[PDB]
Every structure is written in structure tokens, then in C-alpha cells.
Amino acid sequence: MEMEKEFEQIDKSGSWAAIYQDIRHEASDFPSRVAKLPKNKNRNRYRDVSPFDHSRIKLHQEDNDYINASLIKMEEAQRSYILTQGPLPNTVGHFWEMVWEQKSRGVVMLNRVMEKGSLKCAQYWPQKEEKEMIFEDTNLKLTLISEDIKSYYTVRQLELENLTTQETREILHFHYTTWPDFGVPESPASFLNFLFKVRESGSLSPEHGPVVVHCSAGIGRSGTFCLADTCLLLMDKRKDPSSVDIKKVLLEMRKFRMGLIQTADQLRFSYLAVIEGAKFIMGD
Ligand SMILES: O=S1(=O)c2ccccc2[C@@H](O)CN1CCO
């Protein structure tokens, strides 16, 4: 059923809460035993948001391999994403270790460091060229190379150095800075513009490791970004775009990380983004 008609039918009937709860009911439940070990309590931002054991990213170290991060592997769409929490004061070195080990080209940040007057993630990248950051626990150096500030997002070029080998890589930081403190954006136009800037960079392409995507918990805004990208890609490669089922794509993605899309308003916003984005994909 053409999702644009499914959309008007749910909107006229005001059933968004009902659709959303049906997804919550059918979603996968897999063990997260590593996340709940007592040694890992200060590596989790939220007690109720954990990576499944089967899909968690492992750090390459014998001490403790744990980070709150999941690999979302979309077989047909041929896309992979790492979804993670906003880094904590004691996990900023783990965060950059993961970007290095997984060969990521891009980091996508969908939150501000402070929202609603509280800290939602650590200040984990340098704000000035001449003040680099050293992560002594993981042996990495991070330098700000350049910054491009736009009305709805900022793009940064960063240099990450493995201090053990003196290899360096360019990482691109895509920072969406205008998601409102409450609710979802009124129009998806600026979110789609941002998505298209990340795609244009190469950060989502198979020649690199998976893109790292985060917000505060790494399930709500982060879920909206990967759901929209995957649905638009499937509309492109398929003979019949109309066969793309957003609810089924979301349930597939929830096999790899719990809780993706946190509210009925985030579900409706995801539909709006895919419907408006398709008017490019289908040749405009
Ligand atoms: O490729 S999907 O994301 C996809 C695409 C279009 C319609 C439905 C679906 C779902 O089955 C989940 N997917 C993989 C498992 O089948």
C-alpha cells in the first residue's frame, strides 16, 4: 500500500499511537548480558538502553571489550551503520578507538552537548585548531582541521592519529544542530538536506567502514536517520518503489538494536521524510 495513502489514512484516523505500540509489541528481544555486567555500569548512559550481545561492537583489547554500540547490517539495501550513545566522560577514548578499529570515514551527531539545561553527551572533539585532544587510555590524538558552520548543521574535518603506529586518517564530523529540544521538526526539508550532505561525502559508501551515528541514547533521532536512508535506497534499486514497507524495515533494524524510534511523533516524522525524499529519488 503506497505509504503516502497509508499516511493520510493514519493521520485522518489519528492512530499514530496505535501503530507505534504494535511495533513495540512485535519488536525482537535478544539478550544484552555483557551490557549488564557490574564492571560496565559506568559505560552505559541509560540503564534501559543496551546493545544486544549478537550485534554489539567489540573493542580490540583484552582488558574490557565493551562499548554501548550496535552494528545494523541491511542486507538488500547493502548499507551498514553503527548506532551508539553519546559518549560519556569515561568512554570518549573508547568512542575514538571504535571509529579507528571499524575504519569509519564519518561520525553523524544529531544532538547538542547541552539540551533542556542538562548535558546529553561529553565535549568529545576539539573546538580550536591549536588545542588538540589526547586520549591516553586508547593512545589516540584528535585535531580539528577545519569547520564549516551552516544554518541547520556544521561539518568538521578532523585528523585522528594512532599514536602507536603514527598512521593518520581524515574523519568527517556531520553535526545536525537544530533538532528541537521537544518534539520533531515541522518540515523534514532540513533533515533530508543534511542526509544528502552525508551521502555526498562518501561516509555511507562500501569503500569505508560503517558510519558512526549517535544522539543521546542512540535509538530515537539516530533510528530516524538510518530508517530514512535505508527506505530511500530500497525505493531507488527496486522496480516497484510502492513495495517499500517502512514498518517492516523498522522491525528488521530492531533485530540489531532495541528501541529504534522512541515516540509516535518520531514514527510520523520518518514517514514524512521518506515521502518527501522520494520526490527526488524518482527523478526530480
Ligand atoms: O530490506 S528490508 O529492510 C525491507 C524492505 C522493504 C520492505 C520490507 C522490508 C523488511 O522485510 C526488512 N528488510 C529485510 C528483511 O526482510
| CATH code of the domain covering residue 141 | 3.90.190.10
Give the span between the Cα atoms of 243 and 260, in whole angstroms: 22
Rounded to 5 degrees, what are φ and ψ at 103? 65, 30
Task: Please state, as a whole number, how many other Cβ atoms lie within 10 Å of the Cβ of residue 151.
Answer: 7
The overall longest dimension of the chain from CA atoms, in Å, is: 60
Give the span between the Cα atoms of 253 and 73, in whole angstroms: 8
Residue identifier of the C-alpha nearest atom 16 of ligand 1: 252
The residue among 265, 259, 273, 258 whose CA lies nearest residue 31 is 258
- Gap from CA of 249 to ligand 1 centroid (Å): 5
CB-CB contact of 94 with 59 (8 Å): yes
Cell digits of residue 199: 551521502
- Gap from CA of 76 to ligand 1 centroid (Å): 8
- Indicate the resolution in Å: 1.8
104-125 burial, b at 16+ Cβ within 10 Å, e below that, comes to: bbbbbbbbbeebeeeebbeebb
Q: Which of 23, 238, 249 to mutate to test the pocket of ligand 1 (most atoms within 8 A of CB)?
A: 249
Ligand 1 binding pocket (C-beta < 6 A) is 74, 76-77, 230, 234, 244-245, 248-249, 252
Three-state secondary structure call for residue 150:
coil
Give the span between the Cα atoms of 246 and 113, in whole angstroms: 30
CB-CB contact of 110 with 127 (8 Å): no
> Which one of the listed residues 121, 215, 226, 231 is annotated catalytic?
215
What is the extent of the structural domain holding 256?
A: 1-283
Q: Where are the alpha helices (DSSP H) in the chain?
A: 3-13, 16-26, 33-36, 92-101, 189-200, 221-237, 246-253, 264-281
The count of structural domains within the chain is 1
The residue among 26, 116, 74 whose CA lies nearest residue 244 is 74
Q: What is the sign, positive or negative, of the torsion defined by CA atoms of 191, 193, 194, 198?
A: positive
Calculate the CA 255 to chain-centre distance.
Answer: 16
Give the span between the Cα atoms of 270 and 225, in whole angstroms: 8
Confirm whether 226 is a catalytic residue: no
